[PDB]
Design a protein around this ligand. Structure first.
Ligand SMILES: [Au+]
Ligand SMILES: [Au+]
Ligand SMILES: [Au+]
Ligand SMILES: [Au+]
Ligand SMILES: [Au+]
Ligand SMILES: [Au+]
Ligand SMILES: [Au+]
Ligand SMILES: [Au+]
Ligand SMILES: [Cl-]
Ligand SMILES: [Cl-]
Ligand SMILES: [Cl-]
Ligand SMILES: [Cl-]
Lengths: 173, 173, 173, 173
């Protein structure tokens, strides 16, 4: 094994790699969500970047996990990326729910890995997640919640008009 | 014939001139569309420039075709410009459909001329269309598609209110 | 089908999607190659970015293909991404060969798609590849060839010392 | 005892002081390593600063521990500093191994102190180590690993020439 490796469990090594996959899968889902909203028959530019900036961020989470894996003396193993769960994503509201659900899944994987870190007494891993992931994921889920409430409130009245306003007035383009 | 002319078919020369007419007719349609939306009883400033910047662009396509005709040793022949197909253009939605249809017609004329170029083995003509027209026309038709989807979605709910918002929030003024 | 779609074959639509997969797979291979060279027991910073800037570029090819798919009125379908072909990538020389091979495969897929475009008489697609992919891929394969020759020449003499010099003096960090 | 002291165990107080000694001993080792490489018969300027900037950093760790000790209401007790383990440090490779070993020892002392913090329920101490030491030590050990791999690879071929290149091309001066 590695010349540098110290207090780094094979369990955590393996779980970090699983987390890289989850983050890359999420990035790929957000690409699919992104380009869906760029379809001529959907055409909500604002929604399209929202999900495309999110694709960038999850790819950055996975790249951060990989950097760390190497820093600890673990060995990145890449697995197949399954495709996003859907080919069409519905309304902005349908999409934003799916994202929340996606993000809650990533968050739980994060919490599952803290718990493993604590069980393994790996304080660098705990710190790593606390500094770079836990806080950013809580903030993101909140913002998605906030979007969900606004979209729900708008599209309850007039669906399509509600969709347009939200994209125009909340989301950037 | 011309001192410069080389690999330039009479077929393509003639088809280039037909294309100039089509581009000038389109420019004239976009002028009519433009000033229609500046009527006091229509008054959608945003829609008015959208079509007026498009009148400029098609006049620029025809001027570009004419420059090229001369560059190849062809001889520009101008024909009568028939007037736009309508005197009143309806709603923003009616207007934007007509534009798509107009632009699809121009696009097909472009594709018809590539095919002629290939048949004639005129690689400068093919290149000319690829560099200055094909890509710009695809991008434009997409944007019109995108506008159509947004207008449809808005005016399905509340027609007039939908028209106002689109003009205010999507189109520039 | 789409309101914008014009001269866009289902064959090309499908082949564009296959090309997105190939570009995403390549991006994923270059991530694996990248982080391999960041291992403490490999530690060639220069090689690591070379492959990481390449991961970025192929993700940009796939994003460009997706933008276009939408511009034409096609519908992006995403498939599973198979994992990179190897878990360990050997020497810089082993790695750089694999990249050439990867890039030649992408290039052939590109050439296969031009040919399809020509068969379908889709001049926007041909242009699209010519402008954004064909030239960039030829330039890249050349540079990889150039690296291969330099690495071969260095490591023939002294392997490890040759590897260090190449990374230090040719590649950036 | 102190007017400020709160949730601060005598165990941790004592262990913090032991950690100050370890950091000062390390600083002193890096001074000895530093000036060894400045000998006229060794003369690797690059290696000399590498170890001298490290002497500064460990003195900064100990000063940071002392500031904290005071912040918590502990009382710094200083003990004798034993001299570095060697008078001559061999090659760059011999030196860089010794450093890794030194740094791994400091790292384990850090991990031993987190564990004590957790046992004592001292969350400020845990945080303190996580924020200022754990991450910096992991990053440093990685870089030493990376240097070790490069030095090994160079000096396997030609020892002295390998030493010169590494100092010239990796290390700063
Ligand atoms: Au922990
Ligand atoms: Au944790
Ligand atoms: Au041609
Ligand atoms: Au053509
Ligand atoms: Au073609
Ligand atoms: Au082609
Ligand atoms: Au604690
Ligand atoms: Au801790
Ligand atoms: Cl923790
Ligand atoms: Cl051509
Ligand atoms: Cl072509
Ligand atoms: Cl903690």
């Amino acid at each position: 094994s590695s010349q540098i490796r110290q207090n780094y469990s094979t369990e955590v090594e393996a779980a970090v790699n699983r987390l890289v996959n989850l983050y890359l899968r999420a990035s790929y889902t957000y690409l699919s969500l992104g380009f869906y909203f760029d379809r001529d028959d959907v055409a909500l530019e604002g929604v399209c970047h929202f999900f495309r900036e999110l694709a960038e961020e999850k790819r950055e989470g996975a790249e951060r996990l990989l950097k760390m894996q190497n820093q600890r003396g673990g060995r990145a193993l890449f697995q197949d990326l399954q495709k996003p769960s859907q080919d069409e994503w519905g309304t902005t509201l349908d999409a934003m729910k799916a994202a929340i659900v996606l993000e809650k899944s990533l968050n739980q994987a994060l919490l599952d890995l803290h718990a493993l870190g604590s069980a393994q007494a790996d304080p660098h891993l705990c710190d790593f997640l606390e500094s770079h992931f836990l806080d950013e994921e809580v903030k993101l889920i909140k913002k998605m919640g906030d979007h969900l409430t606004n979209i729900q409130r708008l599209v309850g009245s007039q669906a399509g008009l509600g969709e347009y306003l939200f994209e125009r007035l909340t989301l950037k383009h």
